[PDB]
Every structure is written in structure tokens, then in C-alpha cells.
Amino acid sequence: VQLVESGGGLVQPGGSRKLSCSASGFAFSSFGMHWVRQAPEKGLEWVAYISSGSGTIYYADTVKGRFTISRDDPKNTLFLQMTSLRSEDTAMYYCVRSIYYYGSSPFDFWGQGTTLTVSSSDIVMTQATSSVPVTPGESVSISCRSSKSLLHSNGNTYLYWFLQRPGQSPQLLIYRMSNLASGVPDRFSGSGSGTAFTLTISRLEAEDVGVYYCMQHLEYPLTFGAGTKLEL
Amino acid sequence: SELDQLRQEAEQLKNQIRDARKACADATLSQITNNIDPVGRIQMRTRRTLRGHLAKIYAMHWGTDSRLLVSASQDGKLIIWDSYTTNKVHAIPLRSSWVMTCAYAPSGNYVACGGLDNICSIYNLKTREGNVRVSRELAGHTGYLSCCRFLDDNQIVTSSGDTTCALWDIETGQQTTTFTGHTGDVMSLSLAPDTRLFVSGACDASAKLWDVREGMCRQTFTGHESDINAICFFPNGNAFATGSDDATCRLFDLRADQELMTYSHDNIICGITSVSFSKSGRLLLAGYDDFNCNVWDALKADRAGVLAGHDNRVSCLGVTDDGMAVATGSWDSFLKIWN
Amino acid sequence: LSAEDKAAVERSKMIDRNLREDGEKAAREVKLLLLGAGESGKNTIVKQMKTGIVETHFTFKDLHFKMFDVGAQRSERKKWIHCFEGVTAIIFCVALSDYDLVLMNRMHASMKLFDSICNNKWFTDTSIILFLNKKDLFEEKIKKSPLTICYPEYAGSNTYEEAAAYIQCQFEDLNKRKDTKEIYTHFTCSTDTKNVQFVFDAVTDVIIKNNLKDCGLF
Amino acid sequence: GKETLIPVFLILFIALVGLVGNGFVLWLLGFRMRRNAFSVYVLSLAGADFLFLCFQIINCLVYLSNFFCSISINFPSFFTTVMTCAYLAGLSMLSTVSTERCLSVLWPIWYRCRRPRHLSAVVCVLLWALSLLLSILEGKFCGFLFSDGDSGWCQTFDFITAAWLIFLFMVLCGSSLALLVRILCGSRGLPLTRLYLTILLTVLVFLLCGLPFGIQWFLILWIWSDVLFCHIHPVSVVLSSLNSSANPIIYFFVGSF
Amino acid sequence: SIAQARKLVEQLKMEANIDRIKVSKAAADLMAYCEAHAKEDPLLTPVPASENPFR
Ligand SMILES: CN(C)[C@@H]1CCN(c2cc(-c3ccccc3)nc3ccnn23)C1
């Protein structure tokens, strides 16, 4: 399973450019796709979404009318076209796959990203901490808070935890509050209620150091929260 | 010579077993449950209708979470349903369209199917790619497969129309044990709650009890007058029920080694396709080929209700693990959920 | 509904679309059930027209034919014969060169099987195409061994035509209620290529009758 | 105003019955049962028939109220135009139905395999659209709509409508004859007498219960009288009402046992 | 033919030596099990519409 995207480079303000991503190793037509960007030193930010069958398309408010998303199933490619490029679009772009049915695990594989440089009613997710000093063998807890209840009337809570290690793309840990992802050790646990959530690590090795992010999936436009760093 | 001597010896033991089980019949079940209040009247109603199959349904099976279910039809498709919302999760196309059975794994990771191709196929539901793919094709039988039931993720039990049941190892692909004692086609299976012994019924009008580990036959039950088409355990694990083509259902006991009750009526002249119990064990549901289902008081041999709403033969039915709903399938290509 | 519920609904709609397309494709094909004896001669028919049960596919003048052979299933056939309740035609192969041979005479076994299939409750209005194979060996053997061996009450001339007509009449007379189904009879041999045309002509009548029923006037 | 007491009662009595049958047909085909490529025609027929019968009932009630309870209201003229539309559409579907049957016997393989899936909807939409166009150009140029009339143009459009009806009758007869000849020449495995009876019943009902009203209304009045109106109108409406009510029995109820 | 008869005789011999209990005790056990699980049976006693998933 892999996703490799290309395009990228340095462009002058006012220009237009196209970014491509090619998938290999899975059933591409039965998946939905997201574009997610990260600033040179800031956190994550959601850009656009296209659905399986090409029936539903969603844009953020900073790019609506300037960006376009498309896909080509027979050749297994995803496209994002950009026009009227300002200096705030300098970032690194990632492609993300997700599938939706009863019991699925969305947001479970990310690409590697491409770099773009340009020369010169929303839920708020809060992480009040940063840069916790830790030693191996101890136990750690992280907290998050929302401005609106994420508990729907059907008994679901839509809160996601993500881990990004230095030099690497983010990896999913817990998808729907208290659900553990495939291939993840049982050290990690998640809990919470209503508007207040927490993540717990029991006894930690030296590989689980990085930045931890939280995301909501109750409604669009899919807000993030500035992460918390674990330092050794 | 010795053949006739052995025949006489064999005839001399059926008399002994009959006399042995005639001496432990002091009372009757109707004579003991004559002083309890009857369940008044069951008025059930359709709550959901699942549409999408284009030919006649042959089998169904509930999942252990009581929300997901699997169905099989002659159109060549295997469909997985979410019953709370009435929308489809997976649709699986089959190499052979002559399917007669299907099962669901207790873990929820696998499904199974089979039919007139004499092969049992196992399907994996959870892969890194988003599709469903075949894991094993078990091929050792000489007749059509009539039923199958999982024991865990690596063991399965099958019954065939070549007068044989079998126990398989999925990883290797071989059958560790073969059960051979019947005389006709075996039509139905049932696993005990502790997964240590199982019962089977065949076209010789007999039912047999087996041991999975040792691999031999323990007890034989003979009451019916035609083919046996359905079988099911009591929730306790100490009794079971059977349905046949002679328009009767029967209740058999294990520790007393004989029959306890018959369920029949003079206005019923067709056969029974399926049987199931309620969570407490007080109601017994039976499916008939006069297009409707009947509810029986299992302790008093009385009819407490009718389930009508199908336009053709009722092929299969099932009760959830929490006991909240009942599901019926039919030859009219519809599934219904009653509560 | 939440966002994920809407996504699930879209998934279900696409599944439904694919199912409908597959059903529309499958409803336009001609399905045939092949029956006969072990030595009757069906392999020659399969060759000329192209464990478990076997499936054959072919095409002739913009029509798609699927033929199903169930000769390997040696068990109670009252338990699986209702799977083929909706089927366009039944092909029945009989060899008319084994009246002299004995397994019980073979011809009487063939008659018993034909009688059991013809008067079933699942095939009340289903057409039967009857093939009578190996006429060369019959014409050679009719001169030495008499036909009275099989039919004691024949009382007729001993030649090819009279014997063939007698056997055909004996087979066609086993159809109780011969007012709700049709029986087609053809005389074939090993080297003969006209049988596909015979099957096509038989099936055209069934198609005409079925699409008069879709329009209301039966 | 004195010898027409019975025909209006008959019209009311035989039009009240038809609404129940057509409503049952619409409800049953809507959700109760399934649909094939032939059901669309039955739905369209039932809808047109329902509209026609409802307008007939409204006129009958208006007349009765303005007679027994003389102080009453007036029925707007525009409504009349709508009635005409239904009638014409009601006469189109039948012919279409006949044509379909003929094809399904003269070209069976094409009908079973190569036929398109949305032909029924296209044909029904086109026929309704043409009927509406003709009805509107009849009403506008001849005083039924809120405008000024004319003499020559009303006759021209009335004559065009009569030509359309005659063409429909000829199409129906030709298709029925072709089907009968094809069955007669060679056929094996069909109940013949029932087919002949059904076909002749359809043709006779169409001829003796559909056309007289239209032929009168669009041609006889212009060609010819004091008895031609009053002594001919109620019998014509009686006959059209009878055909209108009798269609659902023939095309949906006799077939289903 | 002799082998089949021998196998049948041995199987009947194995099946004719089993401990059996009375029908009265078995019926009493069945009745007790049904009586001890009556409340936790939604089909026998309907549940209110606020706790019914299929509604
Ligand atoms: C079907 N058409 C619409 C009905 C039947 C015939 N008819 C009619 C109309 C007129 C007329 C012409 C122009 C302006 C106002 C009235 N004059 C006559 C004289 C005899 N019939 N008639 C109306």
C-alpha cells in the first residue's frame, strides 16, 4: 500500500499549478480522498475532500473558488488544481485515504507530501499545553477541549488522535474516541466525555516522541488543534 | 451363518434399549406444566423490510453484536446488512450461483458459503485493501453441502448430502475428523453453547449426537415419519427441537434419552423449513411452506401467534443474541424483521 | 444525520446501482438443463454444441446459452430439483442402440427417468427437447437382434422406420396432461451438425410466449 | 332541460365507479407492486382517465346544483380545455400498447435483448406534450382561454384534431391485424381463442365507446340543426364515460386472475 | 457384509450402557430454567418504546 504525490516547487505570486498523486496496492475506487497541508513550522490544516463515485465535494473557506479537486479512477490518480496563488499557500501537502461504512477506520494511511513555495460557526479545538518533559518508563496524559459537544444522538463521539514523528508523515492512533487502530501497541488508551478528552500512555519507549494532534469529524470544515510536543 | 447370528444379536439390543427407556417415563411434560399460567397472545409487527435480492433467499445468519446479518440468494450474491439503518455494507459475488448455506464468524472477521459445487468457501472481510477476497476453498466432499458452522477462526464443521459430517482445519486445508454413521442425506446442524458436542438430522428420520474431540456417536433419536429438515438446541444445552416434512415438530431430551412433546395441528398439512428458540426458552418459532410462521408455547403445546406477510415459502429465520428481534427470509426475495 | 451517516448512505446507493445492472444483464440469457443416462451420449452433444455440476457457455445468432449438467450428483434428487424451477428448456438424451443391452433393461430405466421428470410439480409448463442418438448402430443391429427383446407386444415389421416410429411413440405417450407443455423430437447421429438450429427453433417459441406474458395478454 | 334528467344521473353513477378503480390502480402501481417496461403505459392511461372522469363529475354536480338550487355559480371555461387534453392522451396510450404487442411477436430476440430501457418514458412524455400543445392551440384560438376568438382558425384546428383521431384508429387496426395474421400462419404453444377474443374486444371497445364523442365534438357540429346538439351529446358522453371506466378492468384486472 | 454387522453390533453395545434419569426431573429442570429467566426476554414481555432499537 503506497501513495506517492508530485508537482511542487517554487512559483511566483499570481500563478497556477497542478498537483498529482498516484496510488498503488489497494482498491482506489472504493475510497474517498482528502488533501491536508502543513505550514513550514505551524500545525495541520484541512483543504478539500472528494468522495467515492465523485458525487460529493467539499472545500475550505480559504480556497473556495481558487482550488479544484478531481480524480481519475482508471489510471488511479488524484488531482488538485490551484489558481491565484498568494504567499499563504506555501506549505507541504499530503494525500489521505478514508472509507466510510459501519465499523470502518477513516484516515488510516497518509502519503509523504510535496512542498510548494510562493515568493513574496466552526468548532474550536484547544490544546492548552506544549512541550512536556518526559523520561522513559513513566506514564503520560494529554488533554483536549472542544467548544461544542461531539456526542451525536446515535451514541457516537467523533474525536481522532494522530502522531507525527520527526521527518515522518502522521500516523493514526485512535479514530473514534476509545477505539485503537491496527498495528498500534496497547500502551495507548483514550477516554473522555462531552467536551473534555484525554489520551494516556502507560510506559513509554524512546520511539513515541513527537507531536500529538486531535481532530473532530462531527461536521465540515473538519477543524484541527495545535499539537503537544513530547521531549526527552 | 454368522451373518444371521449377528443379525439376531443386533435385533436383541434394540429391544433392550427400548425397554430401558420405557422404564424412565413415570410422568409427562403436559402433566407437570398443567398448573402454570399461559402466555396470553403475541402480537408482533414488521419494523424493517430489507430489499435488494433479485431471486429466492436460501439462508441467513445473525452476528454476535445483534446488528449485522448475512444473506445468500440464487442470484449469485452474498449481502451484509445493517439492520438498524437498512443499508448495505458489503456485496460479494460468487463463482458458483447454486448456494444453499451461509454462516457468520463469532469474531466477525470471516464468512462462509457453499452449495451444489461440493466446496466450502471462506471469505475474509478485513484486509489492508478495501475489498473482500477468498481465503480458502475446502474440497473433500462428494455431495452437496447443506449446512456449516464456525467453532473459532480456524475450525469449521460441515454436513453433506453424501452421508457424512466433517471437521476442518482452515490453515492447513485438511479435515481432521470425519463423522460417518447415517444412512441418508444430512440436512441440518447445530452447535452446543459450550462448543463441545453437536447434533445432526438426516433423511433417514433420525437425529444423532456427536463428540467433537473423540469423534464418535453417543446417542440416537428416532421419532419422526419423514425427512428432518431443521434442528436447534435449547438455551440450557440439555434439550433440542426438530422439524420434519410430516407437519410436526418434536422436542427431545438428552439425559432421559427420549421424547417429551409433539407440536401439531389438524389444519397444518405442509412441511417445516426452519426452527428456532427464544432467549428464555418459552417460545418456539417454526417456519412453514404455506407462507407464514407459527409461534408455540414450548411448555404447553399451544399456538400463541402467527407471523404473516410473506408471499411465498419461508426459508429461514433467526433470533438475536440479546433476544430483541426475529428475522425471516423467503422465496419472494425479501427479508423482514419483527419485534 | 452526521457526516459519516451520509457517506454510508452513498455507499449503499452505489451498491444498489451495481446490483440492478447485474440483474438486468442476467435476465437476458437462455438457461438449459441437460439430462440423460451414463451411456446415452451427452459428450457428443456437448462437443457438437460448443465433482459437483458442470456449466457450459456458448453463443448462436445474438443469443447467450448456459447449459447445466448434473450427472455427477448421485444422491436424492428430490432435494435439489427445485433449484431449476425457472429454466427455459430441458434437453433429454436417449440412445436408441441399447434396447438389447442390460445394465433391468436400459431402455426401461430411461423410460422411468423420463416419466419421473416429465410429470413433476416444478416443471408443469416447461418444454422438453428429446434427442435419439446412435441411429447407425441401430440400423445395423435391427437386422440381427429383433426388437421383441425390449417390447414383447410390438407385432410389426422389422426395419429402421417402423422401429424408430414405435420407440418415439412409446416415449411421447408418457406425458400425462399433454395440453400444457410441448415435446420436440429429433433423430441425431455421431456425424451431424444441425442440432443447434433445432434448439434455437425450439427456444424461439418459448421467448415469444414469455414476452406476450410481459405485455399482459399471456 | 326536461328530457335529459336520466342521462346526467347515468353519467354520475358510471363516473363515480371509475374513480375508485383508477385510484386503486395508481396506488397499487405506486408502491404495492413492481414495475416493468409495460407498466408505464398503464400508469399514464390511469392518470389521464382519472382527470377526464373528475372533470365530468364536476360539470355534472355544477349542473345539478344550478338546477335544483338554481342560485349557483358558473364553471370556468378554461377547465374545458384541460378535459380535452386528457381525452386525447387517453386515446394515444391504447394505440401504443397495441403496437408494442405486435413488435414482441414479429421480433422476439430484439425485444428480449436489444431493447432500450427508457423508451417507455420518452414515448409517454412526447405523447403528453403533443396532446397538451394541440389542446392549448385549440383553446387559445377558439375562445376557451381568456382571449379573443376567431372563426377560420377554430375550424382548422378542429379538423387537424379529427385527422389525428383517424390516424390513431388506423394504427391500432393495422397492428392488431398483423399480430393476428402472424399467430394464424404458424404458432405452437399458445391459447389462441383467448387471444382472438381479447384483441377483438379491444378494437370494438375503442371503436364503439371512444370515438363518437370526439367525432361529434370536432366535426359533426361544423358540418351540419337543433336536435344534433341535445339529442346526440348525452349519449356520446355516456359512451366515453363507459370506455373510460372500463379500461382499468381490461388492462390491469382481468389479467391478474 | 460381516464387517458392517460387527460395527453395528459394537455401536449398539456402546450405546446401550448409559446412565438415564427420569422424565419428571428433566421436566422440572426445564420449567425452572424458563421461570428463572422470564424478565430478561423481550419477546415474551414487550419493552417500552424508549428502549426499543427497532422503532
Ligand atoms: C369544438 N368547437 C370548439 C365547438 C364545436 C363547434 N363550435 C362552434 C363554434 C363557433 C364559434 C366560432 C368563432 C367564435 C365563436 C364561436 N360557431 C359554431 C357554429 C356551429 N358550431 N360552432 C365550438
Coordinates of N, CA, C and O in Angstrom, one line a residue, chain D residues 53-102:
Chain D
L53 N -62.4 11.8 -15.9 CA -63.6 11.5 -15.1 C -63.9 12.5 -14.0 O -65.1 12.9 -13.7
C54 N -62.9 13.1 -13.4 CA -63.1 14.1 -12.4 C -63.7 15.3 -13.0 O -64.7 15.9 -12.4
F55 N -63.3 15.8 -14.1 CA -63.9 16.9 -14.8 C -65.4 16.7 -15.1 O -66.2 17.5 -15.0
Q56 N -65.6 15.4 -15.6 CA -67.0 15.1 -15.9 C -67.9 15.2 -14.6 O -69.0 15.7 -14.6
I57 N -67.4 14.7 -13.5 CA -68.1 14.8 -12.2 C -68.4 16.2 -11.8 O -69.5 16.6 -11.4
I58 N -67.4 17.1 -11.9 CA -67.5 18.5 -11.6 C -68.6 19.1 -12.4 O -69.5 19.8 -11.8
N59 N -68.6 18.9 -13.7 CA -69.7 19.5 -14.5 C -71.0 19.0 -14.1 O -72.0 19.7 -14.1
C60 N -71.1 17.7 -13.9 CA -72.4 17.1 -13.5 C -73.0 17.7 -12.2 O -74.2 18.1 -12.1
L61 N -72.1 17.9 -11.2 CA -72.5 18.5 -10.0 C -72.9 20.0 -10.2 O -73.9 20.4 -9.6
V62 N -72.2 20.7 -11.0 CA -72.5 22.1 -11.2 C -73.9 22.2 -11.8 O -74.7 23.1 -11.4
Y63 N -74.1 21.4 -12.8 CA -75.5 21.4 -13.5 C -76.6 21.1 -12.5 O -77.6 21.8 -12.4
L64 N -76.4 20.0 -11.7 CA -77.4 19.6 -10.7 C -77.7 20.7 -9.7 O -78.8 21.0 -9.3
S65 N -76.6 21.4 -9.2 CA -76.8 22.4 -8.2 C -77.5 23.6 -8.8 O -78.3 24.2 -8.2
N66 N -77.1 24.0 -10.0 CA -77.7 25.1 -10.7 C -79.1 24.8 -11.2 O -79.8 25.7 -11.6
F67 N -79.5 23.5 -11.1 CA -80.9 23.2 -11.5 C -81.8 23.1 -10.2 O -82.8 23.9 -10.1
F68 N -81.5 22.2 -9.3 CA -82.4 22.1 -8.1 C -82.3 23.2 -7.1 O -83.2 23.5 -6.4
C69 N -81.1 23.9 -7.1 CA -80.8 25.0 -6.2 C -80.4 26.2 -7.0 O -79.3 26.8 -6.8
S70 N -81.3 26.6 -7.9 CA -80.9 27.5 -9.1 C -79.9 28.6 -8.8 O -79.1 28.8 -9.7
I71 N -79.9 29.2 -7.6 CA -78.9 30.2 -7.3 C -77.6 29.4 -7.1 O -77.4 28.7 -6.1
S72 N -76.7 29.5 -8.0 CA -75.4 28.7 -8.0 C -74.3 29.6 -8.7 O -74.5 30.8 -8.9
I73 N -73.2 28.9 -9.1 CA -72.1 29.5 -9.7 C -71.9 29.0 -11.1 O -72.7 28.2 -11.6
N74 N -70.9 29.5 -11.8 CA -70.5 29.2 -13.1 C -69.2 28.5 -13.2 O -68.2 28.9 -12.5
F75 N -69.1 27.4 -14.0 CA -67.9 26.7 -14.2 C -67.0 27.5 -15.2 O -67.5 27.8 -16.3
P76 N -65.7 27.7 -14.9 CA -64.9 28.5 -15.8 C -64.6 27.7 -17.1 O -64.6 26.5 -17.1
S77 N -64.5 28.5 -18.2 CA -64.3 27.9 -19.5 C -63.0 27.2 -19.7 O -62.9 26.1 -20.3
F78 N -61.9 27.7 -19.0 CA -60.6 27.2 -19.2 C -60.5 25.7 -18.8 O -59.9 24.9 -19.5
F79 N -61.3 25.3 -17.8 CA -61.3 23.9 -17.4 C -61.6 23.0 -18.5 O -61.0 21.9 -18.7
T80 N -62.5 23.4 -19.4 CA -62.9 22.6 -20.6 C -61.7 22.2 -21.3 O -61.5 21.0 -21.7
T81 N -60.8 23.1 -21.6 CA -59.6 22.8 -22.4 C -58.8 21.6 -21.8 O -58.5 20.6 -22.5
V82 N -58.6 21.7 -20.5 CA -57.9 20.6 -19.8 C -58.5 19.2 -20.1 O -57.8 18.3 -20.4
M83 N -59.9 19.2 -20.0 CA -60.6 17.9 -20.2 C -60.2 17.4 -21.6 O -59.7 16.2 -21.7
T84 N -60.2 18.2 -22.6 CA -59.9 17.8 -24.0 C -58.5 17.1 -24.0 O -58.3 16.0 -24.5
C85 N -57.5 17.7 -23.3 CA -56.2 17.2 -23.3 C -56.2 15.7 -22.8 O -55.7 14.8 -23.6
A86 N -56.8 15.5 -21.7 CA -56.9 14.1 -21.1 C -57.4 13.2 -22.2 O -56.8 12.1 -22.5
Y87 N -58.5 13.5 -22.8 CA -59.2 12.6 -23.8 C -58.2 12.2 -24.8 O -57.9 11.0 -25.0
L88 N -57.5 13.2 -25.4 CA -56.5 12.8 -26.5 C -55.4 11.9 -26.0 O -55.1 10.9 -26.6
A89 N -54.9 12.2 -24.8 CA -53.8 11.4 -24.3 C -54.4 10.0 -24.0 O -53.7 9.0 -24.3
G90 N -55.6 9.9 -23.5 CA -56.2 8.6 -23.3 C -56.4 7.8 -24.5 O -56.3 6.6 -24.4
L91 N -56.5 8.5 -25.7 CA -56.6 7.7 -26.9 C -55.2 7.3 -27.5 O -55.2 6.5 -28.4
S92 N -54.2 7.9 -27.0 CA -52.9 7.6 -27.6 C -52.3 6.3 -27.0 O -51.9 5.4 -27.7
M93 N -52.3 6.2 -25.7 CA -51.7 5.1 -25.0 C -52.2 3.8 -25.5 O -51.3 2.9 -25.8
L94 N -53.5 3.6 -25.7 CA -54.0 2.4 -26.2 C -53.3 2.0 -27.5 O -52.8 0.9 -27.6
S95 N -53.2 2.9 -28.5 CA -52.6 2.6 -29.7 C -51.2 2.1 -29.5 O -50.7 1.1 -29.9
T96 N -50.4 2.9 -28.7 CA -49.1 2.5 -28.3 C -49.0 1.1 -27.8 O -48.2 0.2 -28.2
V97 N -49.9 0.8 -26.8 CA -49.9 -0.6 -26.2 C -50.0 -1.6 -27.3 O -49.2 -2.5 -27.4
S98 N -51.0 -1.5 -28.3 CA -51.2 -2.4 -29.3 C -49.9 -2.6 -30.1 O -49.4 -3.7 -30.3
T99 N -49.2 -1.5 -30.5 CA -48.0 -1.6 -31.3 C -47.0 -2.4 -30.6 O -46.4 -3.3 -31.2
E100 N -46.8 -2.2 -29.3 CA -45.8 -2.9 -28.5 C -46.0 -4.4 -28.7 O -45.1 -5.2 -29.1
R101 N -47.3 -4.9 -28.5 CA -47.5 -6.3 -28.5 C -47.1 -6.8 -29.9 O -46.4 -7.9 -30.0
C102 N -47.5 -6.1 -31.0 CA -47.1 -6.6 -32.3 C -45.6 -6.8 -32.4 O -45.2 -7.9 -32.8

